[PDB]
Amino acid sequence: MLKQVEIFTDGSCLGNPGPGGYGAILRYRGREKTFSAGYTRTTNNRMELMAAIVALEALKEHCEVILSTDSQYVRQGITQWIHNWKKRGWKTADKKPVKNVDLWQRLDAALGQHQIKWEWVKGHAGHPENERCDELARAAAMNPTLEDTGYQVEV
Ligand SMILES: [Mg+2]
Ligand SMILES: [Mg+2]
């Protein structure tokens, strides 16, 4: 029996690129734990990944994780893209580098540590933990303290 935990994630960004942040909630037994940090120039999609990465890397043993997010980008990557990446060596079909490969690879490493059941959510409405993660992410985007060193500036 693996430890059973719940993770909720969201990203937020004031531009594209602009200041942004991530928010994550990790719930196990009774102890609830929040994660957030703000970055001076990033994208929403990079913050969506960081939220999952940071919450997963926090786990210090093999767990059964229920991971809830409304990110259509993470969903597309998890369910549509990463299988192609793993047989093409993390390049596109045209042999080009994959966008955000630094975070996708880091997320995939953390994903391999646990038994993940993904819960895709249509929207914040009717999901209080996912809306709290948006609040956490937005709060960090309004008070950025770090640089997103992996963001390759597209502008
Ligand atoms: Mg989001
Ligand atoms: Mg958001």
Author numbering: 1 to 155
Give sentences copied directly from the paper behind this entry.
The ribonuclease (RNase) H family of enzymes catalyze the specific cleavage of RNA strands of RNA/DNA hybrid duplexes and play an important role in DNA replication and repair. RNase H cleaves the phosphodiester bonds of RNA in double-stranded DNA/RNA hybrids, leaving 3′-hydroxyl and 5′-phosphate groups at each cleaved site. This catalysis requires divalent cations such as Mg2+, Mn2+ and Zn2+. Structural analyses found that the DEDD motif coordinates the divalent cation at the active site, acting as metal ligands, and constitutes the pivotal scaffold for the catalytic reaction. In addition to the highly conserved DEDD motif, a histidine adjacent to the active site (His124 in E. coli RNase HI) in the loop structure between β5 and α5 has also frequently been discussed.
In the RNH_Mg_2 structure an Mg2+ ion is bound in a different position to those in the other two structures, RNH_Mg_1 and RNH_Mg_3, which are very similar to each other. The exact reason for the observed variation in the binding of the Mg2+ ion is unknown.
